[PDB]
Design an enzyme around this catalytic site. Structure first.
Site, PDB file in Angstrom:
ATOM      1  N   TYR A   1      16.017  15.978  45.246  1.00  0.00           N
ATOM      2  CA  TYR A   1      16.845  14.990  45.868  1.00  0.00           C
ATOM      3  C   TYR A   1      18.211  15.572  46.303  1.00  0.00           C
ATOM      4  O   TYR A   1      19.188  14.839  46.527  1.00  0.00           O
ATOM      5  CB  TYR A   1      16.976  13.753  44.967  1.00  0.00           C
ATOM      6  CG  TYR A   1      15.772  12.819  44.981  1.00  0.00           C
ATOM      7  CD1 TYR A   1      15.195  12.375  46.186  1.00  0.00           C
ATOM      8  CD2 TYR A   1      15.230  12.353  43.772  1.00  0.00           C
ATOM      9  CE1 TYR A   1      14.093  11.484  46.200  1.00  0.00           C
ATOM     10  CE2 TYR A   1      14.115  11.444  43.760  1.00  0.00           C
ATOM     11  CZ  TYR A   1      13.562  11.019  44.966  1.00  0.00           C
ATOM     12  OH  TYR A   1      12.524  10.134  44.865  1.00  0.00           O
TER      13      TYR A   1
ATOM     14  N   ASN B   1      11.604   1.547  44.142  1.00  0.00           N
ATOM     15  CA  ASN B   1      10.697   1.247  45.245  1.00  0.00           C
ATOM     16  C   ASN B   1       9.366   2.006  45.163  1.00  0.00           C
ATOM     17  O   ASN B   1       8.856   2.492  46.156  1.00  0.00           O
ATOM     18  CB  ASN B   1      11.441   1.442  46.600  1.00  0.00           C
ATOM     19  CG  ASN B   1      11.842   2.913  46.865  1.00  0.00           C
ATOM     20  OD1 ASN B   1      11.569   3.817  46.058  1.00  0.00           O
ATOM     21  ND2 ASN B   1      12.517   3.137  47.986  1.00  0.00           N
TER      22      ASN B   1
ATOM     23  N   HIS C   1       7.475   7.698  46.545  1.00  0.00           N
ATOM     24  CA  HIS C   1       8.179   8.495  47.562  1.00  0.00           C
ATOM     25  C   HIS C   1       7.164   9.199  48.409  1.00  0.00           C
ATOM     26  O   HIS C   1       6.140   9.662  47.880  1.00  0.00           O
ATOM     27  CB  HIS C   1       9.038   9.585  46.883  1.00  0.00           C
ATOM     28  CG  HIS C   1       9.230  10.823  47.721  1.00  0.00           C
ATOM     29  ND1 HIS C   1      10.305  10.996  48.581  1.00  0.00           N
ATOM     30  CD2 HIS C   1       8.460  11.933  47.867  1.00  0.00           C
ATOM     31  CE1 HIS C   1      10.195  12.153  49.208  1.00  0.00           C
ATOM     32  NE2 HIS C   1       9.071  12.731  48.814  1.00  0.00           N
TER      33      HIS C   1
ATOM     34  N   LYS D   1       6.516   6.753  41.349  1.00  0.00           N
ATOM     35  CA  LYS D   1       7.757   6.914  40.596  1.00  0.00           C
ATOM     36  C   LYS D   1       7.593   6.201  39.254  1.00  0.00           C
ATOM     37  O   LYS D   1       6.648   5.459  39.089  1.00  0.00           O
ATOM     38  CB  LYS D   1       8.946   6.365  41.396  1.00  0.00           C
ATOM     39  CG  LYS D   1       9.234   7.051  42.734  1.00  0.00           C
ATOM     40  CD  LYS D   1      10.285   6.189  43.549  1.00  0.00           C
ATOM     41  CE  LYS D   1      10.815   6.969  44.680  1.00  0.00           C
ATOM     42  NZ  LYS D   1      11.930   6.263  45.498  1.00  0.00           N
TER      43      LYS D   1
ATOM     44  N   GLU E   1       8.408  20.105  50.093  1.00  0.00           N
ATOM     45  CA  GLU E   1       8.216  19.339  48.887  1.00  0.00           C
ATOM     46  C   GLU E   1       6.908  19.731  48.169  1.00  0.00           C
ATOM     47  O   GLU E   1       6.880  19.885  46.930  1.00  0.00           O
ATOM     48  CB  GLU E   1       8.280  17.851  49.226  1.00  0.00           C
ATOM     49  CG  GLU E   1       9.689  17.408  49.656  1.00  0.00           C
ATOM     50  CD  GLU E   1       9.749  15.943  50.108  1.00  0.00           C
ATOM     51  OE1 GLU E   1       8.678  15.300  50.192  1.00  0.00           O
ATOM     52  OE2 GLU E   1      10.872  15.431  50.380  1.00  0.00           O
TER      53      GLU E   1
END
Ligand SMILES: Nc1nc2c(ncn2[C@@H]2O[C@H](COP(=O)(O)OP(=O)(O)OP(=O)(O)O)[C@@H](O)[C@H]2O)c(=O)[nH]1
Ligand SMILES: Nc1nc2c(ncn2[C@@H]2O[C@H](COP(=O)(O)OP(=O)(O)OP(=O)(O)O)[C@@H](O)[C@H]2O)c(=O)[nH]1
Ligand SMILES: Nc1nc2c(ncn2[C@@H]2O[C@H](COP(=O)(O)OP(=O)(O)OP(=O)(O)O)[C@@H](O)[C@H]2O)c(=O)[nH]1
Ligand SMILES: [Mg+2]
Ligand SMILES: [Mg+2]
Ligand SMILES: [Mg+2]
Lengths: 149, 149, 149
Positions: free
Chosen positions: B49, B112, B115, B9, B126
């Site tokens: 998302y 974080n 993903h 990310k 995905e």
């Protein structure tokens, strides 16, 4: 922002693991905001570890911690107290989680590499004990807008 | 062989941790089979998302993820989905296990690091969303006969 | 001081991870006290893994372990048996804890990087099986007074 007190103990110093432990702290996102190498005077040890006075490991603790320099630190980040404890690992390095500081570097409960404040708090109390705040710098860092919303 | 989708990310990109995270993936035995650095268009974020539309963190999620490039990846290995989740760590990096990507590198739940697909599926879904398969290479590697029976 | 037997299996050898695994052992505080690279003769494999004779994975185990050299080791430290198991990780590397040897480097249960004695014990028994003690050195190290009280 929340601060905690951390201390690299004489075992990590004498094992030349200062940089390694600091690296583990830094790369987690925690900001080093005060830090000094120092011999711990007797009276400081005893007040630091006051709560342990009755305990079987006390005399050994005081001796060990006054036996070579320590690297004392103030470290800043959201949830810093609990974050630090999580990466440091449980008190006995044989049960401390692999990937933690104690879990990877430590062997025995009395020589367990590093100390972290166990709560808001004793943090902070320990910060005030070890550091005057002219010793504590305050600075924004480029990663901050990326660690935090 | 099982594939999953992984994404580094904008926090890890902007913290210059691309190589570190990729290293943790590689040395686990997982085979990088597609991989590209890309800015995430709005419409891709929102479809990626989608399941989070009602949630308090949604708007922040979409903003963050479109705020700098990501390193999108397809990664292949036996049990790849669950393996990746295990090395990535739980969603809140303060509870993620030490030695995990989030447990070592991340601070807060919204920043974080990486993903991973949470199941077979959402993997795939995905993979198809992010990659056309002319983008996905297929190749045997020398270690394969050593990872697997 | 307690000893255990450790073995770097042909998967780690063929994946060129010998130094990495040894590093994880050393930095934990464990003292390498015997160590040799060797091809495992059939009869040694079969006696080593005797307890597994009835089991579905047996034939595969014996083949794998005799398929390239292993790095056999004797390792010494307080609570060495249980310490080693903790840093090695659970048998299936997909559940082994991140930060452990299997948790970071291994994929599948049958190719899981390294073996450690599972108890005092079988330690040890395994040490005597693999090593004559003219092969086992005894030496004090500078860090010892720092690992231990
Ligand atoms: N030798 C020995 N030392 C122990 C024993 N139990 C605890 N200690 C020492 O005292 C500490 C006890 O843990 P805590 O309750 O968190 O307080 P503390 O760990 O001393 O505080 P810090 O070490 O500075 O984090 C350990 O760090 C050890 O250094 C023991 O059974 N034997
Ligand atoms: N700011 C903020 N973000 C959150 C919060 N809870 C979840 N998130 C974000 O949304 C995600 C929620 O976790 P999951 O249910 O696995 O879905 P996801 O993690 O968004 O999917 P990936 O992040 O791409 O793995 C986290 O990665 C965070 O980025 C929260 O309480 N506050
Ligand atoms: N292919 C395959 N191998 C397995 C399976 N279960 C166990 N093994 C192998 O046998 C071992 C079983 O674990 P343990 O009971 O601790 O004994 P051991 O692990 O063989 O002993 P070491 O591997 O030398 O530590 C694993 O290391 C694997 O190498 C299985 O289901 N499939
Ligand atoms: Mg403690
Ligand atoms: Mg998540
Ligand atoms: Mg085993």
């Amino acid at each position: 922002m929340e601060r905690t007190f951390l201390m690299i103990k004489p075992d990590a110093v004498q094992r030349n693991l200062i940089g390694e432990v600091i690296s583990r702290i830094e790369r987690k996102g925690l900001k080093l905001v005060g830090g000094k190498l120092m011999q711990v005077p007797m009276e400081l040890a005893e007040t630091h570890y006051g709560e342990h006075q009755g305990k079987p490991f006390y005399n050994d603790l005081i001796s060990f911690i006054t036996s070579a320099p320590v690297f004392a630190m103030v470290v800043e980040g959201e949830d810093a107290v609990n974050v630090s404890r999580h990466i440091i690992g449980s008190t006995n390095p044989s049960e401390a989680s692999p990937g933690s500081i104690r879990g990877d570097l430590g062997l025995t409960v009395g020589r367990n590499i590093i100390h972290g404040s166990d709560s808001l708090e004793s943090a902070e109390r320990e910060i005030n004990l070890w550091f005057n705040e002219n010793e504590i710098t305050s600075y924004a860092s480029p990663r901050d807008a990326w660690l935090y919303e």
